[PDB]
Structure 1
Amino acid sequence: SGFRKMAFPSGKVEGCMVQVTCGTTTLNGLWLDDVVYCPRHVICTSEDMLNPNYEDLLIRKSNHNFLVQAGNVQLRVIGHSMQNCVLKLKVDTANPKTPKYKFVRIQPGQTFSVLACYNGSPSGVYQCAMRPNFTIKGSFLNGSCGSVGFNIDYDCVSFCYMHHMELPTGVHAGTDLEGNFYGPFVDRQTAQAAGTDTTITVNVLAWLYAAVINGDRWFLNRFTTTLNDFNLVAMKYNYEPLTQDHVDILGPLSAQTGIAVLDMCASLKELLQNGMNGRTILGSALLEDEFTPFDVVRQCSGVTFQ
């Protein structure tokens, strides 16, 4: 028993992280087969970032302007191309540590692990969620750009996030591994608005089911409610509306605990309207939304990977 915000084991990803240097700028890249992936702004100076013309900047760079280092091995760069906001550097050596991998674009509300890196070397791993407004609330310092987010499925690493920048508000924005930003952001140093952010309701419900499984039951109430009645309340507190698809995904947790989804919703509605009044749930004084239904099932059934 017990319940923790758990990250995926990072070993398969650690063997893919390299250091990419172009001119003065150094950041992290991801080396899979014979291609290194990194944020295109590796080719920018600090002044360039205010207003970069990436095509004009890239034309002034040749294959030998890129220093790629995997530990104490330099890799030789044999071609380079820009794909949206990522650079693809073809190198002469295929990574012998390349795991089975996929590139995936995740949806808001999904969770993933981030391996925070500096100079191509790992610093730490943590779990977070893609917010409904397409930002993430990470922990990133200068030089962490190119750090990647990932999930693991048995033997397969699914890469879903590459870090590109910190907004003036202190939240983080990045791309999938095809170089397309999550959200309306662009890779330039200018004020950029994120959307209003909302709480991920299906995740909160999953977490309440985790709490029941672990013995926290005090919030279970007599009442019930309807989907429209609940969504009317959730919108008043900036919660995402719940759909039938969300109810379907919660089915297994309903079966395991014997608590119908709409009953669990009526408990939540009362927590929203009256608060927690100094009590806690799974050790927390706030309603938690960074666990998906699949995360709860994984942690409560003990799933493992290759």
Structure 2
Amino acid sequence: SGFRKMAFPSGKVEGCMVQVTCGTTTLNGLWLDDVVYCPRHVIPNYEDLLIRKSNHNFLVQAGNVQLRVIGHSMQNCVLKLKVDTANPKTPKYKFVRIQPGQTFSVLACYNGSPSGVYQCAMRPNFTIKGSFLNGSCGSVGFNIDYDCVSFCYMHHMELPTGVHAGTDLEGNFYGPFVDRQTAQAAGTDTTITVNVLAWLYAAVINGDRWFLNRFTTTLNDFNLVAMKYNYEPLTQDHVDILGPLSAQTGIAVLDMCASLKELLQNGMNGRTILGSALLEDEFTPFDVVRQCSGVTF
């Protein structure tokens, strides 16, 4: 029993966190094998600014040991500092680009030191509601798949509303954001519907059944309602992905959709679901399964 916002164990990522200094700027780097990846804004014609930099301009620090940079290249908005020393703690890893609605763990770092780990989701508006202070640039987002760390995010900036923007580990920004000093704003955000339904299945598994009803709905009727409440449209793939939880609890996906339809029109009415007075959208259907079955890393 119990339901918590749970992150992946951060250990495999911790051994990869380094400090990257260039001039007056100090941020974080991800040291994998003999390459250290970091936001290119550490150095805006970025090809022109990078041509003026020398290898000894980048001071890379792994704990106490200083690493010597032997090369540098740029891939989209990530800088790739080739170092002489390969990371002995390099885990089995992949660079994956996640879709909006997908969740991941963020190991927030300052001066190459991990300060905390938290779970968050890629919002439909391509921002992440993270927790970052100055110096957190280069902190990474990741998932663990068996014994493989899938790096999906590198923090670059904070938007004027306090939400965060960053890139995948190939330097491609999530959303219409750029690493240039200009006016940027997060677009209108929507609720991740498949995740709310997954979190409702986790509540049923945990004993919370008050919100259930005898009703069902069509996928079209549900989406017409969901659209009015700024909820993401629920596709047939979302209905298919929720199948295992639907089987485990005995509540059909459209049956739970009718529960959500009533929750949106009528509300909670003083009641809570998993100790929350709002509908939670930062647990994917796989997160609910992993937590309510006991998958390990």
TM-score by structure 1 length? Answer: 0.96
Structure 2 spans left out of the alignment, 5+ residues? none
Q: CA deviation at 1:194?
A: 2.0
Contact 1:220 1:264 (C-alpha < 8 Å) held by counterparts? yes
Q: CA deviation at 1:297?
A: 0.2
Contact 1:114 1:150 (C-alpha < 8 Å) held by counterparts? yes
Aligned-pair identity in percent equals 100
Distance in structure 2 (CA, Å) of the matches to 1:232 and 1:66: 54
Contact 1:17 1:70 (C-alpha < 8 Å) held by counterparts? yes
Q: CA deviation at 1:24?
A: 1.1
Contact 1:167 1:191 (C-alpha < 8 Å) held by counterparts? no
Distance in structure 2 (CA, Å) of the matches to 1:288 and 1:168: 24
Distance in structure 2 (CA, Å) of the matches to 1:264 and 1:32: 43
Distance in structure 2 (CA, Å) of the matches to 1:3 and 1:101: 28
Q: CA deviation at 1:193?
A: 2.4
- Say which SS state the counterpart of residue 301 (structure 1) adopts: coil
Which digits, 9 at most, give the CA deviation of each residue in 1:231-275, with x for residues without a partner?
100000000111110110001001101111110010110000111
Which digits, 9 at most, give the CA deviation of each residue in 1:77-105, with x for residues without a partner?
11000111010010001100000000000
Query: Comparing 184-193 with 126-135, which one deviates more in the overlay?
Result: 184-193
User: What residue in structure 2 maps to residue 240 of structure 1?
Assistant: 232
Contact 1:22 1:66 (C-alpha < 8 Å) held by counterparts? yes
Which digits, 9 at most, give the CA deviation of each residue in 1:81-134, with x for residues without a partner?
011101001000110000000000000000000000000001000000000010
- Say which SS state the counterpart of residue 26 (structure 1) adopts: strand
Structure 1 spans left out of the alignment, 5+ residues? 44-51
Contact 2:156 2:179 (C-alpha < 8 Å) held by counterparts? yes
Contact 2:160 2:185 (C-alpha < 8 Å) held by counterparts? no
Q: CA deviation at 1:53?
A: 2.1
Q: CA deviation at 1:26?
A: 0.7
Q: CA deviation at 1:136?
A: 0.2
User: What residue in structure 1 maps to residue 141 of structure 2?
Assistant: 149
Distance in structure 1 (CA, Å) of the matches to 2:31 and 2:141: 14
User: What residue in structure 2 maps to residue 259 of structure 1?
Assistant: 251
Distance in structure 2 (CA, Å) of the matches to 1:139 and 1:226: 38
Distance in structure 2 (CA, Å) of the matches to 1:99 and 1:222: 49
Contact 1:19 1:70 (C-alpha < 8 Å) held by counterparts? yes
Q: CA deviation at 1:188?
A: 1.6
Distance in structure 2 (CA, Å) of the matches to 1:138 and 1:54: 27
Contact 1:116 1:125 (C-alpha < 8 Å) held by counterparts? yes
Q: CA deviation at 1:164?
A: 0.1
Q: CA deviation at 1:16?
A: 0.2
Query: Comparing 58-67 with 127-136, which one deviates more in the overlay?
Result: 58-67
How many residue pairs end up in the alignment?
297
Which digits, 9 at most, give the CA deviation of each residue in 1:139-167, with x for residues without a partner?
00000000000001111000000000001
Contact 2:29 2:36 (C-alpha < 8 Å) held by counterparts? yes
- Say which SS state the counterpart of residue 112 (structure 1) adopts: strand
Contact 1:66 1:77 (C-alpha < 8 Å) held by counterparts? yes
Which digits, 9 at most, give the CA deviation of each residue in 1:204-242, with x for residues without a partner?
000000000000000111222111111100000000111
Q: CA deviation at 1:62?
A: 0.7
- Say which SS state the counterpart of residue 127 (structure 2) adopts: coil
Q: CA deviation at 1:13?
A: 0.4
Question: Segments of 4+ in structure 1 off by > 2 A?
Answer: none
Distance in structure 2 (CA, Å) of the matches to 1:222 and 1:195: 37
Distance in structure 2 (CA, Å) of the matches to 1:58 and 1:223: 61
Distance in structure 2 (CA, Å) of the matches to 1:118 and 1:36: 16
Distance in structure 2 (CA, Å) of the matches to 1:160 and 1:282: 28
- Say which SS state the counterpart of residue 292 (structure 2) adopts: helix
Distance in structure 2 (CA, Å) of the matches to 1:175 and 1:286: 29
Distance in structure 1 (CA, Å) of the matches to 2:64 and 2:147: 28
Contact 1:237 1:272 (C-alpha < 8 Å) held by counterparts? yes
Contact 2:34 2:83 (C-alpha < 8 Å) held by counterparts? yes
Contact 1:212 1:257 (C-alpha < 8 Å) held by counterparts? yes
Q: Which of 45, 60, 70 matches 1:53? A: 45
